[PDB]
Amino acid sequence: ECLEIFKACNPSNDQCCKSSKLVCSRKTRWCKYQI
């Protein structure tokens, strides 16, 4: 399952939802919308 926004994600294990324009960001420590 993909990770929605504000979801704890790892820099080595990226599993964010691409259909919802979300990407794992180490700055926020979780999935963040792509600017």
Residue 11, Ramachandran bin (φ over 0: left; ψ between -120 and 50: alpha; else beta) = alpha
In terms of residue numbers, what domain contains 14? 1-35
Count up the domains in the chain and report the number.
Answer: 1
Q: Which residues lie below 8 Å from residue 12, measured CB to CB, with a gap of 6+? A: none
Elucidated via: NMR
Burial of 22 (0-12, 13-18, 19+ CB in 10 A): buried
